[PDB]
Amino acid sequence: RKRSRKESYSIYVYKVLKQVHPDTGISSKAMGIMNSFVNDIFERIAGEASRLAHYNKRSTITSREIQTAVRLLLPGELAKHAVSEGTKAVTKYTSAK
Amino acid sequence: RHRKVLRDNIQGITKPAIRRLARRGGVKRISGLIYEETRGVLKVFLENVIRDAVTYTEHAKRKTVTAMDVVYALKRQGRTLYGFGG
Amino acid sequence: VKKPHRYRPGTVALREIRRYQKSTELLIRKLPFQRLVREIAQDFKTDLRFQSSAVMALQEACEAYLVGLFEDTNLCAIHAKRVTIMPKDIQLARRIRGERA
Amino acid sequence: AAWHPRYNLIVVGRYPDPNFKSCTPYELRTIDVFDGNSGKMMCQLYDPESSGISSLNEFNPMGDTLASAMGYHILIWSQEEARTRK
DNA sequence: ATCAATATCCACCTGCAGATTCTACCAAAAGTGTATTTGGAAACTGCTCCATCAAAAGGCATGTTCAGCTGGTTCAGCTGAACATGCCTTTTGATGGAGCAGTTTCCAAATACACTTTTGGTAGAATCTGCAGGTGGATATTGAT
DNA sequence: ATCAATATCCACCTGCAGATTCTACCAAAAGTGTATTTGGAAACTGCTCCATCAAAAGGCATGTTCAGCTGAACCAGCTGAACATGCCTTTTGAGAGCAGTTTCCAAATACACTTTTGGTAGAATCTGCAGGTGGATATTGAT
């Protein structure tokens, strides 16, 4: 009975979907698509942030570097909204430990 | 008998299939010469992809080509693919 | 009617357009594509096996690439005041995309 | 594979393989008959209307008859036409 | 065909900004030795790949019909390369002096690492329903007339 | 334009193949505590950069001029779409290889200290090449 454990991001996506459109479901294949999508974006951002760190002789990757990467990759208003969400989130984290 | 189905090869990828694909591309009227050229193009693409896949396959000492190798091979050519793992 | 019903040229293609653009099912048959893959893989390494999902993934990629190519092709065609695509259009498209041949 | 009871022969059914290093350029499915104590072949039986693959092949203990069992088929290969009487 | 006009390649040839040589140092490569971490060779388990033969469903190689597209021709405009001319935005070439690139000091702010303690995210076994599929009929759409 | 043909849109019904939901657990998240770092405040220097001037000079603006180009009309012909069809190629269903884990170790490789040590900054010379000088061709167009 060797029993594996393959991780994924499925359940979180399902939660968000039930939050935004309560009377709606989603097949497994589409969830797999969204999983691959998230993986792709994570890889892009991390790689970019790494290069930013190396060019400035900094050994710490910080929220600032993430912010910079997002401003590079993404266009306009999408970047602004993402940045606003991140700033609100980090501000809430820093206070209410 | 020499049947060798249309060549026992690519020529089984018949004309109406290409026509259907051209219909997906918005095309209305197709010349007879397109078919052969299309096949050549397809062959080239496949070759490169398969090579990379097989190379990944050779690194792990396997004889079964997996989906993941193909996905990565498609990623390096700027043709990222979603919906088959990673 | 004495005459069998017959549609004018340039309608059944349109019917095909709307039908295949409303749907997502693969247009190419599996077997010859499968045989093609195996034949090409043989020339690089021997006695390879293929999972089914890998072949399906390749089929999807090929169809998307060709679909995009036909879109670009038709634009190149329309620039020349034609409606019928021809090989030199394809050669132009591949020259512009930066690919080899 | 099987012996022939009264000689030093061998009788086998064939199943082509594109990966096998063929010495012959023509590779068809047929019944082969080899020599035991030498190594090489001496005869090949083939008959259309039986282009299936001969799984089983067995001679008689007598030496004058052959039976073959293919998928969903039983075949008898005995010797043919003779002359006639009044 | 020929011969005048402009633009281009090629032998002589010289002083110097960029190329190379040369000192003198010390911030990187190896040695020695050690502490720590691994990829790959034996067992084992459970998906799922090799690609035959009947029976049957539905797609294609062929041939047949003709309308509407290609791609050639002829041609009325038209518009954009060549060019002279003036003159006027830039080129070299200096000079100043403010301030950012970059360096050094050092220690207060931010994190690995190592341990313990919750906990929820993930297989697997029981329940659900939206949609595949079917059935059927009104209206939209092509086209002959 | 009107009417026939005929595909497409759209109402109504059933069940089952995938969606969803319950349950017992183990890899993973998180809170302490310490040590171990590391990047921003403070304080300075010195190279390189930003606002000005002056003497040309070579490039831009503007204005003529005409050879050669870009659509618009039209059309012989070719060539590629629309259908009958039959016929033949493609779908469906009845054991062993190999991907995926696991042990566990002989081999590989990070890391502390010193000892060299070739690489680099910077002073001090070379010389091929940006110019010039001039002559001989090689395109080009007129005629």
Curated annotation (Swiss-Prot), chain A:
- Positions of modified residues (Phosphoserine): 8
Residue positions, PTM N6,N6-dimethyllysine: 29
In the record, the note on similarity to other proteins reads: Belongs to the histone H2B family.
Q: Which residues carry this modification: N6-methylated lysine?
A: 88
**Which positions does the record annotate as the modified residue N6-succinyllysine?**
6, 88, 92
Keyword terms of this UniProt record: Acetylation, ADP-ribosylation, Antibiotic, Antimicrobial, Chromosome, DNA-binding, Glycoprotein, Hydroxylation, Isopeptide bond, Methylation, Nucleosome core, Nucleus, Phosphoprotein, Ubl conjugation
The chain residues annotated with the modification PolyADP-ribosyl glutamic acid are 7
Q: Which GO terms describe its cellular component?
A: CENP-A containing nucleosome; cytosol; extracellular space; nucleoplasm; nucleosome; nucleus
MF terms in GO:
DNA binding; lipopolysaccharide binding; protein heterodimerization activity; structural constituent of chromatin
> Where does the UniProt annotation locate this protein?
Nucleus; Chromosome
Q: What is this protein called?
A: Histone H2B type 1-J
Residues the record lists as Omega-N-methylarginine modifications: 58, 64
GO terms for biological process? Answer: antibacterial humoral response; antimicrobial humoral immune response mediated by antimicrobial peptide; chromatin organization; defense response to Gram-negative bacterium; defense response to Gram-positive bacterium; innate immune response in mucosa; killing of cells of another organism; negative regulation of tumor necrosis factor-mediated signaling pathway
Describe which stretch of the whole protein the shown chain covers, with first residue, last residue and complete length.
30 to 126 of 126
- Residues bearing PTM Dimethylated arginine: 51
Query: Which source organism?
Result: Homo sapiens
The secretion signal range is: none
Using the UniProt entry, state the residues involved in the cross-link Glycyl lysine isopeptide (Lys-Gly) (interchain with G-Cter in ubiquitin), renumbered to this chain: 6, 92
- Which residues are recorded as modified (N6-malonyllysine)? 88
Sites of N6-crotonyllysine modification: 6
Curated annotation (Swiss-Prot), chain B:
Residues recorded with modification N6,N6-dimethyllysine = 4
What are the N6-methyllysine sites (modified residues) in this protein? 4
Sites bearing Phosphoserine, chain numbering: 31
**What's in the keyword line of the UniProt record?**
Acetylation, Chromosomal rearrangement, Chromosome, Citrullination, Disease variant, DNA-binding, Hydroxylation, Intellectual disability, Isopeptide bond, Methylation, Nucleosome core, Nucleus, Phosphoprotein, Ubl conjugation
Residues that bear N6-(beta-hydroxybutyryl)lysine: 15, 61, 75
Changing residue 82 to H has the effect of: In TEBIVANED3; results in early developmental defects when expressed in zebrafish embryos
**Residues carrying N6-succinyllysine:** 15, 61, 63, 75
- Spell out which residues are annotated as carrying Phosphothreonine: 64
Q: Where is this cross-link: Glycyl lysine isopeptide (Lys-Gly) (interchain with G-Cter in ubiquitin)?
A: 75
Residues modified to N6-glutaryllysine: 15, 43, 61, 63, 75
Q: Function, please?
A: Core component of nucleosome. Nucleosomes wrap and compact DNA into chromatin, limiting DNA accessibility to the cellular machineries which require DNA as a template. Histones thereby play a central role in transcription regulation, DNA repair, DNA replication and chromosomal stability. DNA accessibility is regulated via a complex set of post-translational modifications of histones, also called histone code, and nucleosome remodeling.
* Protein name, UniProt field: Histone H4
Q: Which residues of the full protein are shown?
A: 18 to 103 of 103
UniProtKB/Swiss-Prot annotation, chain C:
Q: Give the sites modified to N6-succinyllysine.
A: 22, 45, 88
Please give the residue positions where the record annotates the modification N6-(2-hydroxyisobutyryl)lysine: 2, 22, 30, 45, 88
List of residues that carry N6-glutaryllysine: 22, 45, 81, 88
Q: Which residues carry this modification: Phosphotyrosine?
A: 7
Record GO biological process = chromatin organization; epigenetic regulation of gene expression; gene expression; nucleosome assembly; telomere organization
Where in the sequence is N6-acetyllysine found?
2, 22, 45, 81, 88
N6-methyllysine, modified sites: 2-3, 22, 30, 45, 88
**What residues bear Phosphoserine in this entry?**
23, 52
PTM info? Acetylation is generally linked to gene activation. Acetylation at Lys-88 (H3K122ac) by EP300/p300 plays a central role in chromatin structure: localizes at the surface of the histone octamer and stimulates transcription, possibly by promoting nucleosome instability.
Outcome of substituting residue 2 to M:
Found in pediatric undifferentiated soft tissue sarcoma samples; uncertain significance; somatic mutation; also found in a subset of human papillomavirus-negative head and neck squamous cell carcinomas; uncertain significance; results in global decrease of H3K36me2 and H3K36me3 levels and increased H3K27me3 levels
The portions of this protein that span the membrane are: none
Task: Locate the N6,N6-dimethyllysine modifications and list their residues.
Answer: 2, 45
| Residues with PTM N6-(beta-hydroxybutyryl)lysine | 22, 45, 88
Quaternary structure, per UniProt, is: The nucleosome is a histone octamer containing two molecules each of H2A, H2B, H3 and H4 assembled in one H3-H4 heterotetramer and two H2A-H2B heterodimers. The octamer wraps approximately 147 bp of DNA. Interacts with TONSL; CHAF1A; CHAF1B; MCM2 and DNAJC9. Interacts with NASP; NASP is a histone chaperone that stabilizes and maintains a soluble pool of Histone H3-H4 dimers.
Name of the featured protein: Histone H3.1
Gene name of this polypeptide: H3C1
In terms of the parent sequence, the fragment covers: 36 to 136 of 136
From Swiss-Prot, chain D:
- Taxonomic lineage from the root: Eukaryota, Metazoa, Chordata, Craniata, Vertebrata
Q: How is it modified after translation?
A: Phosphorylation by ABL1 negatively regulate UV-DDB activity.
Please provide the record's free-text comment about the domains of this protein.
The DWD box is required for interaction with DDB1. Interblade loops of the WD repeat region mediate most of the interaction with DNA. A hairpin between blades 5 and 6 inserts into DNA minor groove and mediates recognition of lesions and separation of the damaged and undamaged strands.
Residue span relative to the full protein: 342 to 427 of 427
Its family?
A: Belongs to the WD repeat DDB2/WDR76 family.
As for what it does, the entry says: Protein, which is both involved in DNA repair and protein ubiquitination, as part of the UV-DDB complex and DCX (DDB1-CUL4-X-box) complexes, respectively. Core component of the UV-DDB complex (UV-damaged DNA-binding protein complex), a complex that recognizes UV-induced DNA damage and recruit proteins of the nucleotide excision repair pathway (the NER pathway) to initiate DNA repair. The UV-DDB complex preferentially binds to cyclobutane pyrimidine dimers (CPD), 6-4 photoproducts (6-4 PP), apurinic sites and short mismatches.
List the signal peptide residues.
none
Placement of WD repeats on the sequence? 2-45, 55-79
Q: Under which name does UniProt file this protein?
A: DNA damage-binding protein 2
Q: Where in the cell is it found?
A: Nucleus; Chromosome
What is expression of this protein induced or repressed by?
Expression is induced in response to treatment with IR or UV and this requires p53/TP53 activity.
